[PDB]
Amino acid sequence: GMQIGKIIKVSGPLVMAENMSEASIQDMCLVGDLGVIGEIIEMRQDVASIQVYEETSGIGPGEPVRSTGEALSVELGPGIISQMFDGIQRPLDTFMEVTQSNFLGRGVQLPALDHEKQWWFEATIEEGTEVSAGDIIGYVDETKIIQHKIMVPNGIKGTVQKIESGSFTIDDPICVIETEQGLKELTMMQKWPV
C-alpha cells in the first residue's frame, strides 16, 4: 500500500527522497505537499531518485513523498467503457464534475472508475465449480452494446464457495473462492500494470 518518505533534494525535474525502503523501482509516487506525479528510477540504501513529470516549482526538502505501492496500472471493470482518459488513466469527465474546474489541476487524485455506482451483476457460474484465471463467473450489461464479463483475475485458483446475482458496486465482494491461502473475496474489478 501507500508509503511515505521525505524529500532531501529538489533540482528541476529531479527529486530525492529518503526513508523510501518500502518503495520499489518503477513505482509511481506523489511528490511533495502538493502531490504531483513522479516515478522512482533509482534507489540507494533508503534514498530514491525520482523523475518528476509535472512542475516542481515551489516544492522543497522536508515535504513528503507518497508511494502508490505499485507501478503504473489501470483499473479494469464496469465503468471503463465510453469513458475518456488520459495516458495514466485520469478520468477526464470526472475531473470536470468533481473538480468544477476546467483544468487538470496538479496534485488532484481521482480513481479512474466510478467506485460509488450500482451495477447489476448476473452470476452465471455455480457454487462448487473449480476456477482459474480467465473463467467467467458472471457478467454485467455495461452499455447498450457491450456485455462486461467478470473474469477470475490472474493469481487466483480455487472453488466458488458463495456467489449471488444482485446489485453491487465495483468495490463490493461478489464472490468467495477457496484458494490454497484460505478464502478470498472477489470484486468486479481488477488492477493490472500497463
Binding site: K9, S11, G12, T56, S57, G58, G60, P61
Partner: peptide, 28 residues
C-alpha cells in the same frame, strides 16, 4: 530550512546594496 525550488531571494551586501535572486537547487 523551508526553502522551495524557484523561490525568490534577497542578498543584503556588506555595503547595504540589495540584489535579487532565485533558488535553482535546494538540498537538505
Amino acid at each position: 530550512s523551508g526553502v522551495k525550488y524557484e523561490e525568490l531571494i534577497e542578498v543584503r551586501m556588506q555595503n547595504g546594496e540589495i540584489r535579487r535572486g532565485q533558488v535553482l537547487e535546494v538540498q537538505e
